[PDB]
Amino acid sequence: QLQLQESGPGLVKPSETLSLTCTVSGGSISSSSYYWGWIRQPPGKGLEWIGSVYYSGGASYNPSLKSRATISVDTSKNQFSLNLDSVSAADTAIYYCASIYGSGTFYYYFYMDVWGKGSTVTVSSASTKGPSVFPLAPTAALGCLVKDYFPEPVTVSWNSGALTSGVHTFPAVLQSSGLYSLSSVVTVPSSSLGTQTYICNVNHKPSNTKVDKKVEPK
Amino acid sequence: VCSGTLQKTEDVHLMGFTLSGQKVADSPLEASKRWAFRTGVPPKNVEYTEGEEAKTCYNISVTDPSGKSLLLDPPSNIRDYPKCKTVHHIQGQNPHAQGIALHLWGAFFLYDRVASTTMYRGKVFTEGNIAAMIVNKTVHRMIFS
Ligand SMILES: *[C@@H]1O[C@H](CO)[C@@H](O[C@@H]2O[C@H](CO)[C@@H](O[C@@H]3O[C@H](CO[C@H]4O[C@H](CO)[C@@H](O)[C@H](O)[C@@H]4O)[C@@H](O)[C@H](O[C@H]4O[C@H](CO)[C@@H](O)[C@H](O)[C@@H]4O[C@H]4O[C@H](CO)[C@@H](O)[C@H](O)[C@@H]4O)[C@@H]3O)[C@H](O)[C@H]2NC(C)=O)[C@H](O)[C@H]1NC(C)=O
Ligand SMILES: *[C@@H]1O[C@H](CO)[C@@H](O[C@@H]2O[C@H](CO)[C@@H](O)[C@H](O)[C@H]2NC(C)=O)[C@H](O)[C@H]1NC(C)=O
Ligand SMILES: *[C@@H]1O[C@H](CO)[C@@H](O[C@@H]2O[C@H](CO)[C@@H](O)[C@H](O)[C@H]2NC(C)=O)[C@H](O)[C@H]1NC(C)=O
């Protein structure tokens, strides 16, 4: 099974350049029936196709971004990368790399077979800041407060992924300080409060921070 | 056998009838499924005299991912089909493509007074076949007025 994984910086300063790399796994990038492309999704907007390349090197871009975007492929490393020059604030989006399957007798008929996970790219001159995790001590509810981090995103797990039911990870909110604040809670029965232990696995990739906070009552 | 008489060699005419009149799919998606690329086959051409007014015509440009167009260079005698109701402008891609584009049904890519085995680059065409028939000078004048 094909599986694509993005690997970008997450934060790029204005007027600088953005570089993301998409590594294909479970299958060779040097296949006749596949094109490899990039699609970005701005906050609260639709999907915008940036470009696409063939394993030989045949590039193809969207007219608006053709002046900036340059997508290259690396057969020896089994990956393809996007380079968007002169990045601006309007390019803050979630960049998805996708696998475009093509089959055809006369010309290829395309549909984007497999998609990537997505990279939250934020175009800002502000510096990176790691988060601070605080417990929300307590059917009773308990959670964690991930305050003062930049940029997005933050992924919060519970009990190393074992606890999943009834977990609500709220969307981040930008404070007046320019930093984001996130909250993730879970509703568990009151009887299990004393017996079972609860930990939230907060992870902030842009700052390379992984915090395992233990939430206890009182 | 002795039925019918041919006076001059100008009276024998070849009429090209579009596949549109045969009530086949005119959509370019289903029409693109009727063609394919194959190497090792020479392209042949036959000239005809009359043709039908086409319902849908196609101006296709299938290119390599590098940009190389895979369709053959049209010879000088090849020109756009005269009468088309709608002309679909299509730009395709095919990296694996080899050889030249042929018709899977055995039909011909109809050009102006020419039927071709291959689809030529940057030239409007329509799918169809031709038929041999005899109409004398007086009968031909009546149909076209
Ligand atoms: C004069 O006018 C007539 C009628 O207008 C016209 O007849 C048409 O001929 C063409 C062939 O030249 C016919 O096209 C074939 O259609 C059949 C039937 O398709 C139906 O059934 C399939 C399957 O049930 C459905 O999915 C489909 O939706 C339809 O309902 C197909 O079976 C044919 O495909 C096979 O042959 C192709 C040849 O090019 C292959 O490319 C294709 O892969 C198919 O191969 C099969 O066998 C392979 C090995 O056995 C296998 O690998 C394949 O996977 C597949 O199983 C073909 O598309 C068309 O239907 C006819 N039209 C009508 C209305 O009947 C004449 O052509 C025309 N004459 C001239 C000179 O123009
Ligand atoms: C079909 O497409 C071809 C090419 O895409 C068109 O040919 C172009 O015509 C313009 C105007 O005459 C020229 O400036 C270009 O140089 C031509 N390009 C090529 C590659 O020949 C052709 O005009 C199209 N036909 C129709 C009816 O639209
Ligand atoms: C074109 O064909 C018509 C019809 O076949 C020809 O008219 C016939 O002419 C013969 C000889 O004069 C008569 O015996 C027939 O009765 C005519 N038929 C009809 C329907 O009128 C006509 O002569 C032909 N024209 C040419 C130039 O050969």
Task: Give an overview in words.
The PDB classes it as viral protein/immune system. Keywords: glycoprotein, viral protein, Fab, VIRAL PROTEIN-IMMUNE SYSTEM complex. Crystal structure of Marburg virus GP in complex with the human survivor antibody MR78. Chain A: MR78 Fab heavy chain. Organism of A: Homo sapiens. Chain B is envelope glycoprotein GP1. This is part of a larger assembly, with chains A (218 residues) and B (145 residues). Chain A starts with a strand and ends with a strand. Chain A has 1 helix and 19 strands. In chain A, strands 2, 4, 5, 6, 9, 10 and 11 form a 7-stranded mixed beta sheet that branches. In chain A, strands 12, 13, 15, 16 and 17 form a 5-stranded antiparallel beta sheet that branches. A 4-stranded antiparallel beta sheet of chain A has the order 1-3-8-7, with no helix packed on it. Chain A is mainly β and 218 residues long. Chain A folds into 2 domains: 125 residues, no CATH class; 90 residues, Immunoglobulins (Immunoglobulin-like), CATH 2.60.40. Chain B has 145 residues and is mainly beta. Chain B has one domain. In chain B, 9% of the residues lie in helices and 39% in strands. Chain B is built from 2 helices and 10 strands, in the order βαβββββββββα. Chain B has a 6-stranded mixed beta sheet with strand order 3-9-8-10-1-4, with no helix packed on it. A two-stranded antiparallel ribbon of chain B has the order 2-7. In chain B, strand 8 and strand 9 form a beta hairpin. The two termini of chain B are 31 Å apart. The chains are: A mainly beta (218), B mainly beta (145). At the A-B interface, loops of A face strand 2 of B. A molecule of 2 linked components (NAG-NAG) binds next to strand 5 of chain B.
User: How would you sum up the global shape of chain B?
Assistant: elongated
Radius of gyration over C-alpha positions of chain A, nearest whole angstrom: 21 Å
Given the helix and strand composition of chain B, which structural class is it? mainly beta
Number of helices in the DSSP assignment of chain A: 1
Query: What is the 3D shape of chain A?
Result: elongated
* Main beta sheet of chain A: 7 strands, mixed
The two chains with the largest interface, and their residue counts, are: A-B, 16 and 19 residues
H and E string of chain A: EEEEEEEEEEEEEEEEEHEE
Percent of residues in β-strands of chain B: 35-45%
- Which sequence of strands runs across the widest sheet of chain B? 3-9-8-10-1-4
Helix proportion range of chain A: under 10%
How many discrete structural domains of chain B? 1
Secondary-structure element order of chain B, N to C: EHEEEEEEEEEH
Number of strands of chain A: 19
Subcellular location (chain B): Virion membrane; Host cell membrane
Region (Receptor-binding) (chain B): 3-145
Glycosylation sites (chain B): 59, 136
Membrane topology (chain B): Peripheral membrane protein
